[PDB]
Paper text:
To delineate the structural basis for antibody-mediated neutralization, we determined the cryo-electron microscopy (cryo-EM) structure of a prefusion-stabilized Omicron S trimer in complex with representative Fab fragments.
The strauctures of XGv347–Omicron S structures revealed three distinct conformational states: three XGv347 Fabs bound to a completely closed S with three RBDs in the down state; two XGv347 Fabs bound to RBD in either two up or one up and one down configuration. Unexpectedly, the epitopes of XGv347, A23-58.1 as well as their sister neutralizing antibodies would be normally inaccessible for the RBD-down conformation in the WT S, but become accessible for either up or down RBDs in the Omicron S owing to a markedly outward expansion and clockwise rotation of approximately 10º of three RBDs, leading to an approximately 9 Å conformational movement of the receptor-binding motif (RBM). The XGv347 paratope comprised 5 CDRs with heavy chain and light chain contributing 70% and 30% of the binding surface area, respectively.
Author numbering:
A (entry chain D): 343 to 587
B (entry chain I): 1 to 107
C (entry chain C): 14 to 68, 75 to 240, 251 to 294
D (entry chain G): 1 to 123
Amino acid sequence: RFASVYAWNRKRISNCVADYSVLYNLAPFFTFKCYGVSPTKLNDLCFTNVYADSFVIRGDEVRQIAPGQTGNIADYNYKLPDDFTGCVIAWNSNKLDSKVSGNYNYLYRLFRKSNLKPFERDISTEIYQAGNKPCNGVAGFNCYFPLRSYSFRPTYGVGHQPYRVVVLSFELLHAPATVCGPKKSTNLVKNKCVNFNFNGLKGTGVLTESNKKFLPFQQFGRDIADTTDAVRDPQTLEILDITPC
Amino acid sequence: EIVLTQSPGTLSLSPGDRATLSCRASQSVRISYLAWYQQKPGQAPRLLISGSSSRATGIPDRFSASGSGTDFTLTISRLEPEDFAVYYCQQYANSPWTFGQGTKVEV
Amino acid sequence: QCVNLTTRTQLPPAYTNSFTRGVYYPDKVFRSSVLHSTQDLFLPFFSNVTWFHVIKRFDNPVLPFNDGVYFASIEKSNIIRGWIFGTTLDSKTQSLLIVNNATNVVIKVCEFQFCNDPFLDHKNNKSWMESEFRVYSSANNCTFEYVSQPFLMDLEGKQGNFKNLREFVFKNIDGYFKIYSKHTPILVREPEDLPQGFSALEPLVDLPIGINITRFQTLLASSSGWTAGAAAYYVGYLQPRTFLLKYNENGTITDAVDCALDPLS
Amino acid sequence: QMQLVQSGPEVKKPGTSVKVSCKASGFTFTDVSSLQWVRQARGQRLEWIGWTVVGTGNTNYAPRFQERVTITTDKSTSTAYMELSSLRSEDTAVYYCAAPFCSETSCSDGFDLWGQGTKVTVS
Ligand SMILES: *[C@@H]1O[C@H](CO)[C@@H](O[C@@H]2O[C@H](CO)[C@@H](O)[C@H](O)[C@H]2NC(C)=O)[C@H](O)[C@H]1NC(C)=O
Ligand SMILES: *[C@@H]1O[C@H](CO)[C@@H](O)[C@H](O)[C@H]1NC(C)=O
Ligand SMILES: *[C@@H]1O[C@H](CO)[C@@H](O)[C@H](O)[C@H]1NC(C)=O
Ligand SMILES: *[C@@H]1O[C@H](CO)[C@@H](O)[C@H](O)[C@H]1NC(C)=O
Ligand SMILES: *[C@@H]1O[C@H](CO)[C@@H](O)[C@H](O)[C@H]1NC(C)=O
């Protein structure tokens, strides 16, 4: 289940590792486009804070979700910033959301005083007075409900079926890093002149096996003249030794 | 489902004189959501006062709206010879609407 | 929920000559049988550490925080619970919470409105329980949440035989928050008298929070009035100096000496 | 301009479904506009059938007109279709449609616009 457009839900993602190959390779992702970032370069960039927005919309207003658009759903339920960070993913799901007897659970805002500020997680269900004369109590002339329930049926074709859309937005190195892409881990070569990159310690030499004690309190050895001569393998606890070629 | 009665039913006043008409309803006291229309034989009615205080476009200033209770009164300063029509009070209660009986004026 | 306990008896906090304690491994490296001189933040040798004894006694004021704190507690009952501090605690300022009650560690950075006399001690005479846990009135804009395993813990509360001795040091560097801890058990010294010797402190965790801490408050544990046992803790303020440090053949630090105390040094 | 055109007078036989409409030239039903339909016989006071809201879709009819009259307002085509069945001799009258000047901005509490009407009779 997804929250309705007027009251879309937001989930917070931080302090975890995100893999996008499973995101990229999934078949039913129809609309997968990004503006500020490239989809293929998301596996090697660190994001300070990631939060996602989920909702279900019709097939006609899929275009209006783009930044800079104006519409009854792009201005009265959710507005995008002019400088929109991140991107959105949209697809058609007529199997689940659509109901044979009529799915009326989803609603959207019709009438409002003005366009809402971008990134607003608030909603008001108060009645709307169309005329200038004050109105209150029960709905009357020039007094109508500002929300309409979605009409989704399995018989409805393209442009009217429900669409599940997720919005991903994040900062760019404006805070201590929380979520980062996975790092490659190749095999280990012993007794050979290689270019090691142990946990970001670039260098050159040959890796051997040493008997120095590295209590896990320690992490990284050195020598008298302050030159690296011993490292600990991150994959396995064994301690290696480094001597120049 | 509103029983609205307009008085007087028939009027015979000289042109240029001041006249007043009233309409009453059996529903609750209602002021600001009652409108007056004048219609001709063979011509569609056109709104003349609505909201008990506002006017439509092109409405002459002769029409005056008064009444604080259920009674709604329309006052005309001078009966110009085109004002001879039938008057109808109509409600906006969102309940079943019912037009008035009709206030007929003749020379 | 909180109660204005007041009834705060006042005793003069003592000053004790911290002889040698207050050194830690300065960085996550290793070195074998050498001497290394480094400039960093440490506790002065033979410095006057503030001594607080709490029983019939209930003392926990707002200790100022100025770039590093060395906290040494000698108790068996584990009355001291955690460290909670903001800037005004008026539901308007960011606040930080370190709590380990029974089997967890909760690490929170959120908006909080606290009480005049916050406390988790007080429930039915000397039966310890996490009463008045909700010292925070509400949360406005929560920023960071974290859960981890608790440290070494002692069950129930008893008076005397303070075999366990805990030494922590907390500091804030480049926004990150760093903690170095060491607990020594079975320490057999009954009448106070902070022992000599030498023991450094390994790092434990880093917290990426980035807040400016102007003050910190400690917390220890029929909501008014309690029968608590003896509990001694000492607070010292760090400051910059240059130290010389000796590594043994295995790599553990065995001796150190400052460069500003004695002309011989 | 703000102008409305209705259909023409018609004569029909009993038992035939009747479609009634009035269109607006240059005026749209948008999202806020509503519209009412009234009837007038020969020398009789006006009678109100029903008023419907184009935006929300709420339909209100006369208590005696809950069985055989259907009014549908289409914003895309900006029209009001009425399906009417069982037209006896009492339905021989002229139909009018009234709408307020209300296009997405604001409007008063009256139906200023009015249609010339369809004179529909069934023998
Ligand atoms: C901690 O940091 C905040 C934000 O930098 C400080 O808030 C400032 O408070 C002073 C009043 O003393 C105001 O004049 C500034 O405008 C505030 N900063 C901003 C960005 O508005 C806060 O004072 C700092 N804490 C301490 C103890 O200085
Ligand atoms: C203590 O009393 C003061 C003043 O009456 C009040 O502001 C404060 O909130 C009280 N604190 C508690 C914990 O009751
Ligand atoms: C500092 O501690 C010494 C004991 O080591 C004491 O004699 C002296 O009075 C203390 N300083 C102050 C200001 O109390
Ligand atoms: C500590 O936290 C864990 C995890 O939620 C919980 O199961 C446990 O009961 C907590 N201990 C307490 C509240 O004493
Ligand atoms: C413990 O103290 C609380 C707080 O007054 C009280 O509600 C509770 O009943 C006490 N426990 C027992 C067993 O009476």
